[PDB]
Each structure stands twice: as C-alpha cells, then as structure tokens.
C-alpha cells in the first residue's frame, strides 16, 4: 500500500543523511577545533598570572635586569622571580628530592596545576583519567642528594606530572628548541583528535640553571647588551635571554561544549615543518616559514585576510627579523582584501626570549587580547627596521591601544609563530571562542557564600587575601560567579573557611578578615574531617516568635510543613502554619500541646532541607 | 522516457557509493596501516646490520 516511489524516497534520504554524518566525521578527524580551556603563565616581569602579563604589556614595561645572585653564576637578562620556589609538600615530595629536582620540573608541576584551575577542573576528578601531558623542554645543567637522575631526565618532566596527578594518557617531553612548546601543542591536538586522550596539558618550561647558556651565547654574539629584545626595530642588536612556564589545557571543542566548559579560544589549525637545506644549521629560511604559515591556513580553512593579528617569533636579531618580516609580507601582507593592515608584535619585547616557553607565552598573550577584543600590545622601541619593506602598508607594528577587529567570518583570529635554531618551525591559528549558548533550593538569598580551601592555615589565609585583592581590583564581577567558581571549579582541601556577603565590597572586607585571624560576624572556619554527621534533635527550649517563618517559602521546606499540617489538623484542632505564620486566633505557642508538635514539624522540615 | 524508478535508482546507487568512500576515508584517517619500508640497526654484538 506504499508505492515504490515512497519507499525508495525514505532509503535515499537515509543514505544521504548517513553520507552527511560520514563527511562530518571526516572533518572532525582532520580539523576539529581544539578548545583552549585553561592557561597558566609564570614568566619574567613579576608575571605569575596570565592577567599579570596583560598588565605588563598594556603598561609598556619590560623586564630586563641584571642576573640574580641566588643562582651560582656586564650581564643582563630576563628572570622569573620564584624560579627556585616550590611547594614540595603540596605534591607529596620530600625536601631531599625537591632539592635534587631541576627547577624546570618544579615550575611545570606548579604551572600545570594552575592551568587546571584556570580550566575550572578540580584536579582530583582527573585521577585515572585519560589525560595526556606534552612538555616542550630542553636539558639545562642544574646538577653539574639522590633522586638526581629522576630529577634531571627530560622524560620525567612530563611523566612526573602524570604520576603526581595520576594521569594515564601519553606523557612526552619534546625538544625542537624555541618551537618546542608549539610543537608540544601541535602534537597534543593530533593526540586529542586521534582519541589517544580526552584532555591534554601542553606547554613549555625553561629556567636558566647551569653556567653554559648565558656565557655560551655571549661568545656566540647573539645577545643584546641591554638584555632587551627590540623586534622589528632599527635598534635591533640581539635577543635578551629569558625563561618561564606557559601551559594550556586542550580539549576537543565538541567535548568542551558538552561539559559546559568556558572556552578561552580555539586552535583552528597548526602546522610544523622544517627549514631543510638552508644556509646553515642555524640559519632561518624565509621560504620554509611561508610553507608553514600556508599549511596552517590550509588546516584551519582560512586565508591570510582572516587573521588581524600576528604574534611573531620576534627575537630582535638584526638579520633574523627581516627574514621573518619577508615571509609575513609574502603571506599575510598580500591579498589583505581591505581587511586593514595586519598588526604585528612579539611578547619578547616585554619578557625576553623565553626559549622552550616562547611559543605558548605567545598564545597566552593572544588569548588575553581575544578576551577583551583588544590587539595585544608590544613595546616597539625606536624606529621600524630599515631592512624591511613596509611600503605596501599591509603590515603594521601593534604599537598601542588597538581594537582587534574580526574577519569576514565575524571571527577574531591570530597567527602565532615559533622558529627553532634546529630548523623546526611552527605556526598556530588561534580563533576566538564560538558562542556558548545553553533549579535551586534555598531560592531567594540576597547574600552569597564564598568557600575557601588550602592544605594549611597560612595557605588558607593567603588564598583569602589574594581573592580579596582580585575582587577589589575587579569590581563588577558577579558575586554568583565568584561563589560558583570557588565552590565547584576548585578542589577542597582540609583547612576551610567561608565568607557570606551581599556585595563585592562586603566580600572583600570579610575575605580580609579571614586573611587575618579575625572572628567577625559573617565568617566561619574549620577543618574537614570524615567520620560522618550526627543530627541532634534537642528537648524543650528551641521555640521563638514564628520561628522559621522566613523559611516557609523554600519549596522543600513548605512541602514538609504541609504534611504536618494535614496530620496535625486531624489529630489536634489546629495546624502548624497557623502557629508559625501570622496567628489569626490560632493556638498559643505557650501551650505544651502546641509547642511540641510545632517544634516537631520545624525540626523534621529543617532536617529535610539539610 | 526514463521512468522515475530508473532515475532514482541511479541517485540512490551514487549516494551509497559515496557513503562507502566516506567511510573508507574515515578508516584511513583512524587506522590506515603504516608500511615499514626500511630499517637499519647499529647495536651491540658487532651488529652493524
């Protein structure tokens, strides 16, 4: 009774529907965007946080300084403040093993944790999970008491994070020099897309530890005397050495949308290639850099005109920079198509050459700008290099406050480069995050709880002070967002506190009371024991005027009070609501045969709320 | 002069043929065998080959 035309209609439709799914699966395997869900950065310039990096660059400050004496070293560089500081206790490491541990290992472990907190992931949920670790890093000489071999192998920098945090995806250390951290990023996106892992930590770390690297470059002559990088400037005279950590948390975008993760940005495509037969082992190749830029465009399905910002390798070398500018002019500088000139910069003008951490430090910068719609600024000292042809007008240095403007796709994109001395090159397209579009007991509150947690009391008060500073620094941040973050996007340790406030000003004030040992009205503190709760229901004495009248709204509360009302109305002449809510000719709370059944009702109802 | 059944016959066949290719491409991206075309070894025991 169904014609042949109708039946074959439904099979054809199913076949082409199946074909659409197959081809969408193909696109996913080849080019799914990788969401960047978290980021951490411990870089020179007193930059302990990505937001510190934003402050440093919008304030036009750099970080070059004389070498520190804490290390056992006419000598200037860019050094991290707490390169040697490590909370060994937090990670279950003895101070004997911590001393023997390469600072690169220690900074990676701490920065990974902060990246996981930036992604709102309480690290305990990842134990036994399918999570990979991709560390770009290079061997330095820290040990030139026991546990010294495990504390200095490169492979353990990635595996130690897996061990401490209990992760079971692949853990690799990779060395491609200044490109190491973008290669680490590239490999992790391939790993996610292959389903080898469901989450990945990727980034890079370097700390100047042994005598070699600083004096090795001085004789070589690639160092500037200021210790300042002046990338794309006629005052270019070498790079300033640097160090740092910079990590990101990577997740397939489909999984990030599905778990409701705040996405900072997406890796839309990346490429990694080689200089090949160039003028020498350390010589950059402009044509190789075009090849890698164009491959990144291919794998992101975009063209040069769609990127408004380029974060370059920019080292400040007199002859290194023109090669990179040539390669950018031949790619990004042509077929601009009235998108305005591409804006060019290099975080190296502000923090020096972070070596294996250079690349993800550039990503972190780009993400900072993408948050705000603002081109990430660069120092730009002096005049534009005479060795470079900006005649076209299609490349401009990211001098100051610029609005970051989207492409025809209405999407804001940046390209990030890192070229290694070994010849291995990388370019990553970072796009702005897609639109994220998408039940409470104790409903109306007015006030809002902020819970805090740390492994020791002094750490707990420090968390209170730092959250106080952050909220004072950023008013207008919704208190419901602070609370939910502090409650759900953080792990809870043994020493705890909570402040209960109605406005950001009250939260700051009470957080600072927790930072001191103060006992003030809206503040509670204690330590978390397991052992279980005992509910205690006292005898006579708890009654008061319309006790818990304010709780009568809360639906789970009023629900319970209703059942008591039915039962008590049949058995006695009255009900609970008459006695608690306004009493219009209702039994007196002084009568023992009303207070005991009414107290019974309030305690059972409270226990159900609990 | 071609019946509707004959025309839709050729589109259906093309659609399922396109579907077979797509799913073969999926298998390639995920699990194509990688050929080992060469090997060298300089190892202990006077093993130069």
């Amino acid at each position, epitope marked *: 009774a169904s014609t042949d035309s109708e039946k074959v209609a439904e099979y*054809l439709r199913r076949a082409t529907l199946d074909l659409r799914a197959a081809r969408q699966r193909i696109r996913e395997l080849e080019s799914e965007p990788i969401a960047i869900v978290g980021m951490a950065c411990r870089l020179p310039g007193e930059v302990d946080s990505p937001e510190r990096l934003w402050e440093l660059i919008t304030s036009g400050r750099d970080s070059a300084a004389e070498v520190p004496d804490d290390r056992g070293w006419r000598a200037h560089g860019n050094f991290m403040a707490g390169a040697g500081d490590f909370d060994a206790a937090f990670f279950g490491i003895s101070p004997r093993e911590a001393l023997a541990m390469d600072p690169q290992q220690r900074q990676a472990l701490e920065t990974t944790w902060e990246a996981l907190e930036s992604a709102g992931i309480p690290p305990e949920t990842l134990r036994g999970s399918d999570t990979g670790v991709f560390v770009g890093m290079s061997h330095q000489g820290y040990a030139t008491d026991g546990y010294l071999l495990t504390g200095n192998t490169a492979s353990v920098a990635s595996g130690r994070i897996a061990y401490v945090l209990g992760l079971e995806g692949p853990a690799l250390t990779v060395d491609t020099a200044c490109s190491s951290s973008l290669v680490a990023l590239h490999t992790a996106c391939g790993s996610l897309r292959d389903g080898d892992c469901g989450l990945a930590v990727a980034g890079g770390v370097s700390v100047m530890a042994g005598p070699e690297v600083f004096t090795e470059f001085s004789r070589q002559g690639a160092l500037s005397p200021d210790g300042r990088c002046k990338p794309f400037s006629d005052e270019a005279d070498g790079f300033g050495l640097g160090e740092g950590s910079a990590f990101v948390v990577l997740q397939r975008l489909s999984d990030a949308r599905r778990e409701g993760r705040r996405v900072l940005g997406v890796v839309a495509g990346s490429a990694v290639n080689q200089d090949g037969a160039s003028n020498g082992l350390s010589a950059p190749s402009g044509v190789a850099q075009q090849r890698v830029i164009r491959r990144a465009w291919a794998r992101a399905g975009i*063209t040069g005109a769609d990127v408004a910002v380029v974060e370059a390798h920019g080292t400040g070398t007199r002859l290194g920079d023109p090669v990179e500018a040539s390669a950018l002019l031949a790619t990004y500088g042509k077929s601009r198509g009235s998108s305005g000139p591409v804006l060019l910069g290099s975080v190296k003008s502000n923090i020096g050459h972070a070596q294996a951490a250079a690349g993800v430090a550039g990503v972190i910068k780009v993400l900072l700008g993408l948050e705000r719609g603002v081109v990430p600024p660069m120092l730009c000292r002096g005049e534009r290099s005479g060795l470079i042809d900006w005649s076209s007008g299609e490349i401009e240095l990211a001098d100051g406050v610029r609005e970051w403007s989207p492409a025809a796709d209405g999407v804001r994109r940046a390209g990030v480069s890192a070229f290694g001395v070994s010849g291995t090159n990388a370019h990553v397209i970072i796009a702005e995050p897609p639109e994220p579009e998408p039940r409470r007991m104790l409903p109306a509150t007015g006030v809002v709880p902020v819970v805090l947690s740390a492994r020791t009391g002094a750490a707990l008060r420090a968390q209170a002070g730092r959250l106080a500073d952050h909220l004072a620094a950023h008013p207008g941040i919704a208190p419901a967002d602070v609370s939910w973050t502090m409650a759900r996007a953080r792990q809870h340790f043994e020493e705890r506190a909570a402040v209960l406030a109605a406005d950001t000003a009250e939260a700051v004030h009470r957080l600072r009371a927790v930072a001191d040992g103060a006992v003030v009205p809206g503040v509670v503190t204690g330590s978390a024991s397991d052992g279980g709760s005992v509910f205690v229901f006292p005898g006579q004495g708890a009654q008061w005027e319309g006790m818990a009248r304010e709780l009568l709204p809360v639906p789970v509360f009023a629900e319970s009070i209703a059942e008591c009302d039915a039962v008590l109305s049949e058995v006695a002449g009255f009900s609970v609501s008459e006695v608690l809510e306004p009493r219009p000719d209702a039994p007196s709370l002084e009568r023992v045969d009303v207070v005991q059944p009414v107290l019974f009702a309030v305690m059972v109802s409270l226990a159900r709320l609990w | *002069a*071609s019946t509707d059944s*004959e025309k*839709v016959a*050729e*589109y259906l066949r093309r659609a399922t043929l396109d579907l077979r*290719a797509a799913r073969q491409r999926i298998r390639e991206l995920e699990s194509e065998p990688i050929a080992i075309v060469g090997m060298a070894c300089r190892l202990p025991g006077e093993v130069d080959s």
Partner: antibody
Framework: EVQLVQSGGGLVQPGRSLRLSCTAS????????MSWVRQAPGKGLEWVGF??????????EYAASVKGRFTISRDDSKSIAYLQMNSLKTEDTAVYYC?????????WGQGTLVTVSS | DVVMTQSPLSLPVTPGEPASISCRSS???????????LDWYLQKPGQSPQLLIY???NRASGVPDRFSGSGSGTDFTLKISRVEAEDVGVYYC??????????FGPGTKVDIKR
C-alpha cells in the same frame, strides 16, 4: 579503480560502418546503464543513446539523428558496451564518449575520435 | 511544456577568490521525495566531462570540497569557495525532471580573469 577504456575509432569514408568499444573495469558493469555522448569539433555535448541494465530490461533509446543508423549493444560477460555506427556521415564526425549511467553520468571514458571524410 | 534551464554564458574567475554560477529552470525541479533533480558537470579544456554535484547539493566523492551546490525549486547555484587555476572549462547544469536530454546546453565558459 573504476575504468572505462575506449577504443575503436579513426578515419572512415562516408556510408561505411564503424564499431566503438567501451571496456569497463573496477565495478559491476551489469548493474549500470551505459550511454554514448558525442562532441563535434568545437561544439557541445550531444546525447546519442543508451542501453539500460539487464535488471531494467536491457533496452535501448536513441537520438533522432542516429535512430535506425546507430545501435547500442552490451556484453556483460566481457563487461563491454558497444556503439555500432552505420551509414556514417561527415556530420557524424566527433569525439564519442561512453559514460556510466543513463541519467546520472558519473564516470566517463577518455573518448574516441571518429573522422568521417572521403 | 518542455522544461528549459538557463545560466551565465561566460564567467571570468580569479584564483583564490570565490566564484558562483546560477542556474534557473522554467518549472520546479523538486520531486515528491524532497530532492531537486538537478546535476552539475564540468568539462575541463581537452578533457572528458566529470560530475561535480548531483541532486542539487550532494557533492560526489572525489570532487574537491571547494565545490558546492545549493538552491531549490527553480533557482540553483554552484559555488567554488576559492577558485584554483585548474577550475577553467565549461560547467553545465542538467535537469533530470524530463528525459532524455538531447544536449547539455551551451554551459558556462569559465576562464581566468584579467
């Protein structure tokens, strides 16, 4: 891989006869209609005719300018489609393509030139 | 009564740029089963014809994915997202509501813009 290798053309005087071949490979020949399309020098693609698959009767249709002069045949054992041209004319000079399918031409042969001249 | 289909006769194109070719019929090509009986073909210079799109918007496997078809009823469009030099030749849109088709029509001649 799918292949439709053509052969059998060349120079031929008006009024004579000529048979083109189309040898299929890489797919189930017997499942497809097969069609012949030609292109005179410089001009467009012109339909000549096709033969259905056996499953649809293995029957043939032709364009008016070749009906009664040209005939299409197929041999599913050798996986070969044939065009038998009779009483050729100079106007029949063209490149002749066989193509898989009778309505959707989803694979074509390299084509075969037939020059009709005295 | 007989259906006819029209397109732009010649289209200069610019490698790296999008291009587009319109096709319009005298009568709706939508079938009861919900598909538009409209196919696109391309003959490169000195090459045999090839299928690009069938049923209005299904790209055939092996056709470069920069090719797409869209439209419905009487107005259909073939789009190349970014033109490559190798895309020159003649594009034909072929209705299949009424068969046989005696000819492919004059097509659209696509060459390199200057």
């Amino acid at each position: 891989e799918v292949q439709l290798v053509q052969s059998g053309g060349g120079l031929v005087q008006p009024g004579r006869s000529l048979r083109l071949s189309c040898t299929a490979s890489g797919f189930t020949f017997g499942d497809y209609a097969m069609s012949w399309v030609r292109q005179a020098p410089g001009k467009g693609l012109e339909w000549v005719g096709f033969i259905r698959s056996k499953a649809y009767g293995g029957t043939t249709e032709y364009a008016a300018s070749v009906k009664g002069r040209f005939t299409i045949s197929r041999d599913d054992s050798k996986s070969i489609a044939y065009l038998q041209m009779n009483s050729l004319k100079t106007e029949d000079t063209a490149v002749y393509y066989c193509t898989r399918g009778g309505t959707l031409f989803d694979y074509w042969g390299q084509g075969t030139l037939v020059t009709v001249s005295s | 009564d007989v259906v006819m289909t029209q397109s732009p006769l010649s289209l200069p194109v610019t490698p790296g740029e999008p291009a587009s070719i319109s096709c319009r019929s005298s009568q709706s090509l939508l079938h009861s089963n919900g598909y538009n009986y409209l196919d696109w073909y391309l003959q490169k210079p000195g090459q045999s014809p090839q299928l690009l799109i069938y049923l209005g918007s299904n790209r055939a496997s092996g056709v470069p994915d920069r090719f797409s078809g869209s439209g419905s009823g009487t107005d259909f469009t073939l789009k190349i997202s970014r033109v490559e030099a190798e895309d020159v030749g003649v594009y034909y849109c072929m209705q299949s509501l009424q068969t046989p088709r005696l000819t492919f029509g004059p097509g659209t001649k696509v060459d390199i813009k200057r």
